[PDB]
């Protein structure tokens, strides 16, 4: 048992082995402010760099959301569905990892965190914890500014860790605004109610949908708006032509101010508590070793604020839930195995000889994992509960003779 | 020709007097790109969580054949994600292995049991313990997957 | 087991969508029988409320539950807004994904996005087990009446 | 459905039939056209 303790303190820990699906999804996280214009341009550039790899066959870049509730992504985040050529076409010494290394090294633009995860792996990770990356961090709080200050520290300490490739934290108030601070006095002057003014904001400046045409089954949206020119920039809005109810020609800045601001981009509401997620993409190291190192870097180089609560969700969260249920499982497995031996031979300490024959079996198991270069996981875990049931089976038939 | 204002004269003022009526794009929410050489419109089939994927993909697969005729000349449908392609490679791998073990075991239980019928007995037990395992799964409700075959 | 709740609130600030829809929608879905976590989203004119239920909870119970609670809540919401009930599946239910392309130029983005919304979207939803056929990308034809201020 | 031009194009030039290539709700047209040349 002592000689097996070496392969023990040498292997890494993970939740489940990285299963190999035929494809993989590109998720890139970028600062909140990006616009549909530059986002769609940023997208195509990304796809051209993906397709440039001799291994991929198709690429399906998709920024924003699809027509369904199952897709609540913003125009700032992207989900491209990459298809790799048949496994019988990859270059010579190519492996899944050796491909992902060329993808995360070929496809990369300034201010962009690159994440590469399998289709199904991802879509399931997001339904259990929410995080799209294997390693996730949740900074909960009741003061938006505060939790952001914590995500910014925790973010920059994540890139100093040995195995992390690209870590980014989504800002909670990194959105831009152009406020139309109406002036009841200035407007009442021209005899206009707030609503009267606002109509220009929604319909004249914005593309407010007014109605829908009908052609058979299908539907069509109709909208009102000044040519894009009258709404190019803020200044243009300050001189936004308004025809008051009293046929007086004025500018919008005659019934309001317009000031630029910085505020909420999208409020994440996990259990009513506002929260920011920090996406970490480390593939070289083993999961548990990374998160543990992340737990140190964050602990030492970040002083928490009052209402701030940092957490380590992601796949690591699913591992702690299992490791607490399994550590309570061995006793069961050891008292059930202890009595099925207590029944067949009826002898006391004799059943203690067979049940005490599995520790040496577990020993042999770990050695193989180390040599086979495997990570301890819920996959390997079962392999010892089912292996322990066999060491007991044997344990009896070696006492029968 | 949307009426806005009409004098006694009978002379009206239509929408065409204060606006050009052009056909344009709506505020795009979703953007789809293909092979980094063009923007296109797509669609994704959503499966009712808990039903059979391989089951539906088939129906869908053939339905598109029924319509390949009804499609406007020039319309091509390129697929970008087919989960059925994996399920098959995952099921032919479990089967392949589930077959290999069998033989490798039969050969091993045929060298340590040097009689043909002796080994035969164990060889006939597998396809039975196999069947009983499968019959149960139909009553239980456990479809065939790498995990339910890995056991 | 997940059930979505998508409420639309046009042009209203992200903070307003939260203070009037999202928040008062997540706090009521928390105290719903067998609710593990309730993740919420407040976009510029959109309120996505995700409701995750604890293990082994009947899928069609968690559904018919959200709906009855979505009644006594449909009042606390602003006049115009309406709490829509999400599709039966989740993000994982994304099985078959495809793209429409015409290389002859005889058809364009809009011609195909409409081809999706009013042909494929219906020749497909009629297949059992298929809860939804979501159109992605493309462009929606829009009758733009551009008013000349002058 | 057909506008007449006074100057800018020559009889025969190919022109794409789509203002449907720029997101209506704000793709600064001026800068959304600059993305098509270099």
């Amino acid at each position: 048992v002592l000689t097996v303790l070496w392969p023990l303190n040498k292997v890494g820990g993970e939740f489940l082995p990285q299963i190999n699906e035929g494809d993989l999804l590109y998720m890139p996280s970028t600062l909140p402010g990006i616009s549909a214009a530059e986002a769609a341009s940023m997208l195509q550039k990304t796809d051209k760099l993906i397709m440039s790899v001799p291994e991929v066959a198709r690429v399906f870049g998709k920024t924003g959301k699809a027509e369904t509730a199952t897709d609540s992504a913003p125009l700032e985040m992207v989900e491209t569905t990459i298809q790799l050529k048949p496994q019988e076409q990859w270059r010579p010494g190519m492996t899944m990892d050796k491909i992902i290394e060329e993808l995360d090294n070929t496809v990369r633009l300034p201010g962009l965190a690159n994440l590469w995860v399998p289709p199904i792996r991802n879509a399931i990770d997001m339904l259990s914890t929410g995080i799209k990356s294997p390693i996730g961090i949740k900074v909960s709080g009741t003061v938006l500014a505060d939790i952001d200050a914590m995500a910014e520290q925790i973010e920059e300490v994540a890139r100093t860790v040995p195995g992390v490739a690209s870590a980014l934290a989504e800002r909670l108030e990194g959105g831009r605004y152009i406020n139309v601070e109406i002036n009841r006095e200035k407007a009442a002057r021209y005899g206009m109610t707030v609503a009267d003014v606002q109509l220009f904001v929604t319909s004249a400046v914005g593309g407010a949908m007014v109605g829908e045409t009908v052609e058979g089954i299908a539907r069509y949206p109709i909208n009102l708006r000044y040519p894009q020119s009258w709404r190019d920039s803020p200044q243009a809005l300050r001189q936004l032509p308004i025809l008051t109810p009293m046929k007086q020609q004025i500018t919008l800045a005659d019934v309001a101010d317009i000031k630029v601001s910085t505020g909420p981009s999208m409020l994440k509401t996990e259990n009513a508590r506002p929260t920011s997620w920090i996406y970490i993409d480390a593939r070289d190291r083993d999961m548990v070793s990374v998160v543990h190192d992340l737990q140190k870097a964050i602990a030492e180089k970040v002083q928490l604020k009052p209402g701030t609560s940092v957490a380590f969700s992601g796949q690591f969260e699913l591992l702690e839930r299992a490791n607490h249920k399994l550590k309570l499982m061995v006793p069961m497995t050891l008292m059930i195995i202890f009595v099925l031996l207590y029944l067949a031979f009826r002898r006391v300490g004799e059943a203690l000889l067979i049940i005490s024959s599995v520790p040496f079996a577990l020993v042999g198991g770990i050695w193989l994992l180390w040599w086979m270069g495997f990570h301890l996981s819920v996959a390997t875990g079962t392999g010892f509960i089912a292996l322990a049931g066999v060491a007991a089976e044997f344990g009896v038939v070696m006492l029968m003779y | 020709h949307i009426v806005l204002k009409a004098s006694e004269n009978g002379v009206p003022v239509y929408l065409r007097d204060v606006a050009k009526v052009q056909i344009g794009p709506e505020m795009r929410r979703g953007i789809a790109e293909l092979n980094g050489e063009g923007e296109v419109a797509g669609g994704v089939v959503i499966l009712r969580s808990g039903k059979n994927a391989r089951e539906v993909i088939a129906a869908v697969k053939d339905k598109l054949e029924t319509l390949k005729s009804s499609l406007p000349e020039g319309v091509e449908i390129v697929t970008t994600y087919d989960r059925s392609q994996l399920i098959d490679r995952a099921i032919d791998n479990l089967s392949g292995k589930l077959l290999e073990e069998f033989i490798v075991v039969a050969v091993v239980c045929a060298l340590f049991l040097w009689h043909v019928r002796s080994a035969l007995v164990a060889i006939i037990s597998l396809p039975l313990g196999l069947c009983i395992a499968f019959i149960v799964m139909h009553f239980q409700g456990l479809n065939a997957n790498i995990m339910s075959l890995g056991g | 087991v997940q059930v979505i709740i998508k409420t639309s609130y046009p042009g209203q600030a992200p903070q307003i969508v939260e203070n009037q829809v999202t928040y008062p929608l997540t706090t009521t879905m928390l105290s719903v029988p067998g609710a593990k976590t309730v993740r919420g989203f407040s976009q510029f004119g959109d309120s996505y409320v995700y409701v995750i239920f604890e293990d082994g909870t009947d899928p069609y119970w968690a559904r018919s539950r959200v709906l009855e609670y979505l009644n006594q809540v449909q009042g606390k919401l602003p006049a115009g807004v309406s709490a829509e009930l999400g599709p039966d599946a989740t993000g994982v239910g994304w099985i078959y994904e495809y793209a429409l392309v015409d290389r002859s130029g005889k058809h364009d983005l809009a011609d195909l996005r409409s081809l999706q919304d009013w042909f494929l979207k219906y020749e497909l939803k009629t297949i059992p087990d298929v809860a939804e056929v979501a159109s992605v990308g493309g462009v929606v034809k829009e009758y733009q009446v551009v008013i000349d201020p002058q | 459905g057909v506008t007449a031009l006074r100057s800018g194009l020559a009889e025969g030039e190919k022109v794409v039939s789509s203002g449907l290539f720029l997101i209506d709700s704000e793709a600064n047209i001026s800068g959304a056209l600059e993305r098509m040349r270099s």
Binding site: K48, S52 | L34, G74 | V101, D102 | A4, K14, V16, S17
Partner: peptide
């Protein structure tokens, strides 16, 4: 350190809807 370059200008090769300028009457 991939010096892998790529054309940054938008691209539309998946078919385009084209019409030609014609001298005619309104």
């Amino acid at each position: 350190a991939s010096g892998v370059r790529i054309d940054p200008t938008q691209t539309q090769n998946l078919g385009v809807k084209t019409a030609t300028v014609t001298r005619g009457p309104l």
